[PDB]
Amino acid sequence: MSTRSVSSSSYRRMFGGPGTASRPSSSRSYVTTSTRTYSLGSALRPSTSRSL
Amino acid sequence: MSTRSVSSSSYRRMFGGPGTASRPSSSRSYVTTSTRTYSLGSALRPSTSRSL
């Protein structure tokens, strides 16, 4: 017989389906500004009382 | 990352190994060695033995 040899390409592995590796968890970011506590002159300003 | 593919290897995946591509071509013709009850020439010895 001329041997019908086993043509042995990568039917064994290199597959496949879970090619979904690094899904972007970066879709969860947490951006926030340098959050201000605001200044107020209300404790710099006393009551200048006029005595008559 | 590298896919650990325990494949059907690319030497028998497309090549039907042990297997009908390894071709068990065994058509079981029995080699009937036909036994005849005949030694060559035994049917006729013309007997000129008539010793009168």
UniProtKB/Swiss-Prot annotation, chains A, B:
Modification Phosphothreonine, positions: 20
List of residues that carry Phosphoserine: 5, 7-10, 25-26, 34, 39, 42, 47, 49, 51
Localisation: Cytoplasm; Cytoplasm, Cytoskeleton; Nucleus matrix; Cell membrane
Tissue: Highly expressed in fibroblasts, some expression in T- and B-lymphocytes, and little or no expression in Burkitt's lymphoma cell lines. Expressed in many hormone-independent mammary carcinoma cell lines.
N-acetylserine PTM sites in chain numbering: 2
Low complexity bias (residue ranges): 1-13, 20-32
The protein's role, per its UniProt record: Vimentins are class-III intermediate filaments found in various non-epithelial cells, especially mesenchymal cells. Vimentin is attached to the nucleus, endoplasmic reticulum, and mitochondria, either laterally or terminally. Plays a role in cell directional movement, orientation, cell sheet organization and Golgi complex polarization at the cell migration front. Protects SCRIB from proteasomal degradation and facilitates its localization to intermediate filaments in a cell contact-mediated manner. Involved with LARP6 in the stabilization of type I collagen mRNAs for CO1A1 and CO1A2.
Family from the record: Belongs to the intermediate filament family.
Associated disease: Cataract 30, multiple types: An opacification of the crystalline lens of the eye that frequently results in visual impairment or blindness. Opacities vary in morphology, are often confined to a portion of the lens, and may be static or progressive. In general, the more posteriorly located and dense an opacity, the greater the impact on visual function.
Protein name: Vimentin
Organism: Homo sapiens (Human)
Full protein stretch here: 1 to 52 of 466
